[PDB]
Design an enzyme around this catalytic site. Sequence first.
Site, PDB file in Angstrom:
ATOM      1  CB  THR A  90      -0.879  -0.044   1.207  1.00  0.00           C
ATOM      2  OG1 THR A  90      -1.660  -1.132   1.213  1.00  0.00           O
ATOM      3  CG2 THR A  90      -1.793   1.168   1.147  1.00  0.00           C
TER       4      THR A  90
HETATM    5  C1  R1M Z   1       0.801  -6.363   4.183  1.00  0.00           C
HETATM    6  C2  R1M Z   1       1.145  -5.335   4.062  1.00  0.00           C
HETATM    7  S1  R1M Z   1       1.575  -5.056   2.380  1.00  0.00           S
HETATM    8  O1  R1M Z   1       0.603  -3.903   1.890  1.00  0.00           O
HETATM    9  O2  R1M Z   1       1.510  -6.250   1.586  1.00  0.00           O
HETATM   10  N1  R1M Z   1       3.204  -4.584   2.206  1.00  0.00           N
HETATM   11  C3  R1M Z   1       4.122  -5.488   1.655  1.00  0.00           C
HETATM   12  C4  R1M Z   1       4.905  -4.430   0.828  1.00  0.00           C
HETATM   13  N2  R1M Z   1       5.388  -3.375   1.796  1.00  0.00           N
HETATM   14  C5  R1M Z   1       6.738  -2.559   1.251  1.00  0.00           C
HETATM   15  C6  R1M Z   1       7.164  -1.906   2.364  1.00  0.00           C
HETATM   16  C7  R1M Z   1       7.780  -2.416   3.644  1.00  0.00           C
HETATM   17  C8  R1M Z   1       8.433  -1.997   4.541  1.00  0.00           C
HETATM   18  C9  R1M Z   1       8.611  -0.604   4.061  1.00  0.00           C
HETATM   19  O3  R1M Z   1       9.230   0.052   5.289  1.00  0.00           O
HETATM   20  C10 R1M Z   1      10.590   0.616   5.260  1.00  0.00           C
HETATM   21  F1  R1M Z   1      10.718   1.355   6.350  1.00  0.00           F
HETATM   22  F2  R1M Z   1      10.889   1.106   3.941  1.00  0.00           F
HETATM   23  F3  R1M Z   1      11.435  -0.436   5.360  1.00  0.00           F
HETATM   24  C11 R1M Z   1       8.315   0.157   3.106  1.00  0.00           C
HETATM   25  F4  R1M Z   1       8.299   1.455   2.955  1.00  0.00           F
HETATM   26  C12 R1M Z   1       7.690  -0.605   2.161  1.00  0.00           C
HETATM   27  C13 R1M Z   1       4.487  -2.628   2.383  1.00  0.00           C
HETATM   28  C14 R1M Z   1       3.507  -3.564   3.473  1.00  0.00           C
END
Ligand code: R1M
Lengths: 315, 306
Positions: free
Chosen positions: A1
């Site tokens: 998201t």
């Molecule tokens: C169940 C959550 S989701 O919408 O499937 N999704 C998976 C992809 N994700 C990308 C993401 C993960 C962590 C993050 O934080 C960080 F600080 F950059 F590490 C980020 F920016 C993006 C979001 C959650």
Amino acid sequence: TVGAVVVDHEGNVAAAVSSGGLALKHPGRVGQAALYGCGCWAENTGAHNPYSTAVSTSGCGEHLVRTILARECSHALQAEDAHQALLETMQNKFISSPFLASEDGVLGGVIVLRSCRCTLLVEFLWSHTTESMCVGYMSAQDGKAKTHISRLPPGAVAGQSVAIEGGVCRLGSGGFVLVHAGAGYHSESKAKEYKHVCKRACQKAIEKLQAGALATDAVTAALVELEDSPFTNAGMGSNLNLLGEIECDASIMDGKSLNFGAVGALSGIKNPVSVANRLLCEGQIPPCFLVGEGAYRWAVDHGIPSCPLEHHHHH
Amino acid sequence: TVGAVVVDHEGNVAAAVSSGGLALKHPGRVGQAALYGCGCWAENTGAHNPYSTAVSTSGCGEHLVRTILARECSHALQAEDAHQALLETMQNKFISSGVLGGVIVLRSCRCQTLLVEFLWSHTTESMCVGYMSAQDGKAKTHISRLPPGAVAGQSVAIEGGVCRLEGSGSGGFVLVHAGAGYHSESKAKEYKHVCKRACQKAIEKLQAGALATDAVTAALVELEDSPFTNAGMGSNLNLLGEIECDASIMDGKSLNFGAVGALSGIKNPVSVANRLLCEGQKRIPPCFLVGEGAYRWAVDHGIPSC
Ligand SMILES: */C=C\S(=O)(=O)N1CCN(Cc2ccc(OC(F)(F)F)c(F)c2)CC1
Ligand SMILES: C=CS(=O)(=O)N1CCN(Cc2ccc(OC(F)(F)F)c(F)c2)CC1
Ligand SMILES: [Cl-]
Ligand SMILES: [Cl-]
Ligand SMILES: [Cl-]
Ligand code: NA
Ligand code: NA
């Protein structure tokens, strides 16, 4: 998201959100990013609303839907102390909500802004129960986007704890934008790319504003950048459903008119947020929420860039 | 649009709604009957909710500026004076800031006996409701009209009543509506008739021990099957001549929810929504399915077609 919230130089606000939804989901599952009041909210200041507020959410599962989180945050932010209002919402309305009492953990995040003319006073915040969250923000005056990875403090427990941070900006033809690339597990390897895409997204919105665009066009332009990153679960690179196919949710709200556009379970469109924005634009009874095959057909008929080899019509 | 609200013998509430939506709508348009908090709401009494409340709504497409209607009514019904609360809500959301729609509501509280206050309200010319208690044994059906001289979309009609229940039988109470729209004296007999049959189906379910959600589902199945209601069979056709149904259901005890949107080829949309809610209590199971994928899920779960 992914999400964004924008305020223009007049205090008009807009908010948008876009997602690929739960990985391996059943075909046709529509989640929070399409649902009115859940994924995003934008409401200009009015009689009983002394602040203009914009909210966009993150996370998957039914946690944000069950709680109507975005509109709930917007309502809490009419209190004086924004930080306390958002923190208590995240804790009471989201983590310890009765709607989620049967859950071992509640995972999600929000970005918010609220403005009032005193010059424009813009308070902006982010808050999450996931391990981490990547945000970016920018004022038209400051000229340089700032990005930040918000992390749960040592000793906190993902899904049980809240991290909350924010700041204030005073503000021509300018404005302010806060965006987020998602809330989830920490990925130090991909951290610069998430920060980079948040930076470009902010710059697109600020560019739109400086050129005179509407708040909704500015927030749409930021979400287009965020979708286009192959690393975000939205647009290109959205999670594959149970059949190995892409189905996207997206929505957008205009704080000035209170109009709303949204798409659910949409395939074959490169930028789902663009269809949602087009619905809001055309809608100013026109539809506000289109799903599946008909949404694709509507987008194609309105000149929105498609891809026929990525569109499925099981029927 | 058709709807129903049920309270079981223990004070558990349920709500459901089903619609064919706007005639000639663009394909894939999903309206209020599928949307969480907008089309229906059911919430058992809790910490900040002193009443068990159930709400089902009816509209003709013209979306409201910033309302989330059913959940808003449920919250208004926590005031002392239910009649005034619903009326003020109808006035702000429809007349003040014409918009055509209606609602049915009930609120209960345990006294052990159960006190049930029930109401319906509309800005449409007319609305047909039916209601029945497990004790009284006879369904009551009623056609509510705007007062003569009133103007649809500028006036609110609101009526209701009170029912007491033995708190330890297998009883309960149900309120249904067959739609809110233009008055049709010719079809009035069938509308009252389908509300009567819908109430009796729900009461039969209750007396056999069924859950409130199963009872409200059984009432909406009857309401859907009438060709005179804009739901299930006889739903408005979209711009391309096809039927696309929205439906949802909420459980006051568990606060679980099921919903379908733009659903084609399924005889009883509310049964899919009830099935999603039922399966979601037994990866987070889905609560909202639309279009082809909803049809495939329904077919794969044994829910009948055509
Ligand atoms: C169940 C959550 S989701 O919408 O499937 N999704 C998976 C992809 N994700 C990308 C993401 C993960 C962590 C993050 O934080 C960080 F600080 F950059 F590490 C980020 F920016 C993006 C979001 C959650
Ligand atoms: C908003 C428009 S709609 O397309 O959803 N729909 C169109 C079909 N129409 C049927 C109907 C009309 C009046 C009713 O009440 C009574 F006066 F008693 F007859 C009734 F129960 C059902 C209801 C509105
Ligand atoms: Cl699923
Ligand atoms: Cl339409
Ligand atoms: Cl579809
Ligand atoms: Na992406
Ligand atoms: Na029908």
